[PDB]
Symmetry: C5
Subunit: 165 residues, 5 copies
């Protein structure tokens, strides 16, 4: 378990990209993460949320979303969140996508210099996904953690960008 | 399971590179993906389709195909699709190629800033390949998913390129 | 087991970023690493210590922390330390994060040309974490090793930067 | 199994780098790949063949070989082939080298924009190597596949370089 | 088993970086590699040897060592050797470090365009390390192989740098 921390992040602009596989799990997740964002003061209008078919699209989509925000409510995002739900199938498809999407996101992060919250679940059974999405009774929705983290990192990124230590 | 979406993508130019190992599986896949492309309004003439011997050639081939479209019916592709079929052999050849082709494609994607649909199957038995290719009675051809995704991502890439969020 | 070596590093400026998951393990670790830093003559004021929620944030945070020190007590850090504690859960989350955070740090290191001490534990049970953190009576705290290493590498980085061999 | 295709590639210049571990397997392989090259019209003088001690040297060697051809019978190679034979030992040495050599080659390929045929065997037993090298009576020599692929890709690379689609 | 080859490499300048974990294994290794270097005509004064605490430091240290030699007995090294000894512990620490150090070295190699001999042992038991270090009676020291390879690659690098094929 982690240690909770709520930051201002009211001057933050967050970008979220979620995949659409396993939507019944994606929604609960997205809901929780968006919730905590507002809960932290992020303005509803400063939260961009786009989707893609699968997790594989996550990294490319996040890279481009940010890319767009730069060409420009307005202003390059201060933090990004990638939400996806991978579940083991009968083949190794699961593992090859999980590993690449993982490194992919880690890259976009370091490449871009902008925090990309890892909101991707790499589960083995449906129930595990549900449990991590808060779907099950008294189960902790990790989305909340991700929104919370997005804000913290967004704030931190700014300070670093300001040369503050 | 995912949640498809049909987008316009009639102003899209899609590039497809498929390997030739396990052609009886490649064809059904390619067929389905090309089908859904047209089904989305992609003009037959705006769908380029080239092949390579194995999956290892997929990433290099995709990188160069796009590269070519840039030097130029005409205009850099808006989305790319890599189709390959890896099946476990007796050695670790399967895993070393799958992992590299996977990262390879993920890279070309991020490098190029152009979505590259992951149409590569990493299966353990022939039947699994067939099932994923729609070959087996009342099975689902994933190719359809890939064509569908190619369009969506192509459209999305354009908007991002336009700084739209 | 390694061979101990204490260097001057009194003219060193060290940056430390630690995650907050498993704080009861993080603290003992951080404590030991900071201890050995001072023990080597690093001035208390030349030791910057910031935190992040999870290990995933480690690489991005380290990259940016250093980045900031460059824009500028003052002067780009001579060495960095990433402290995190991953513990196997019920899913593959553990492994996908460990592998990416690992490569992520290795990258920031080579990218930046600045040593980033790998103070991340990839454990299977709570006790293992405690044992590596010196928590368990008469056990060895690896944090000490990391602080010690941070100094050595910091010193070495400088010489290399000076073209000395 | 793949689908055979013989291309011209008489105007091609191919570079081959093979390791020397397990030479009794390397030779049969190299022989077959060189054979099919000529068989496709590649001029004997346009086939450069150098060696290195182990597979680890493969990627660096291929990168530099091509690099050299650029500084310049003459003309940067149109395709490269890396031949190596890894066999599981008692330790994890096998896997750590196979994975790095694999990504290494995939990188040189994408980096360089030149196809690098993956002629590396990642086997578990001597016999498997022999079988893949055509050594074991009636077994298939994969080298033939690699030479064949080198030509196709070489030809294709040229067209892409010409902006042809 | 590999095929032996002794080259001149008397005009070579070799840089060696070894970790200090498991020194009783590192020393025998380093000894053997340095031995074969001299045995090949490398001048004692042209062999630089620095150390680092663990294997994780290997890639960064090698990258910087070379880096230094460039700013400049004198002259950028023609080949580099990384010596480290990883042994499975109770946790996954072993695997996460081995995989990153491996890719790290492979990268410095391709990045730098200078061969970096992989003198890192990824063993499961102390005895395996000893056996690979020639320690056990009548056991073959791999260090000899590495020194030998360093020379060959150094010589080859030069020729490639000279555009020779
Ligand atoms: O297939 N299983 C999954 C999946 N599809 C793979 C991929 O994201 C993509 O849609 C196409 O491969 C090519 O772009 N995506 C997930 O988020 N979870 C899964 O469990
Ligand atoms: O070997 N099995 C397979 C394969 N060949 C490997 C590779 O693509 C290539 O042709 C050469 O290795 C070197 O370029 N390619 C596949 O698409 N599926 C397989 O199941
Ligand atoms: O989940 N378990 C762990 C964890 N959280 C994962 C991650 O670091 C992050 O906080 C979010 O995934 C997205 O940024 N972080 C750890 O350091 N150890 C764990 O054992
Ligand atoms: O060790 N076994 C093998 C090997 N040597 C490892 C490596 O390529 C290298 O020579 C040195 O590690 C450092 O450069 N190389 C192979 O192609 N196959 C093997 O089965
Ligand atoms: O821990 N075991 C080992 C080790 N230490 C890990 C690492 O190299 C480093 O010193 C610190 O983690 C952070 O920089 N280094 C080795 O070469 N072999 C081991 O068997």
């Amino acid at each position: 378990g982690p240690t909770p921390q709520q930051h201002d992040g009211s001057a933050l602009r967050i970008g979220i990209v979620h995949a659409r596989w396993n939507e019944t799990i994606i929604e609960p997740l997205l809901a929780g993460t968006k919730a905590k964002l507002l809960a932290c003061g992020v303005k509803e209008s400063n939260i961009v949320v786009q989707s893609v078919p699968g997790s594989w699209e996550l990294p490319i989509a996040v890279q481009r979303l940010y890319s767009a925000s730069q060409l420009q409510s307005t202003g390059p995002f201060d933090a990004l969140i990638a939400i996806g739900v991978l579940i083991k199938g009968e083949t190794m498809h699961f593992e090859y996508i999980a590993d690449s999407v993982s490194h992919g996101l880690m890259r976009v992060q370091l490449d871009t210099g902008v925090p990309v919250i890892f909101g991707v679940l790499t589960v083995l059974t449906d129930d595990q996904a549900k449990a991590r999405a808060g779907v099950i009774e008294g189960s902790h929705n990790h989305g909340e953690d991700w929104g919370l983290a997005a804000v913290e990192m967004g704030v931190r990124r700014r300070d670093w960008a300001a040369g503050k230590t």
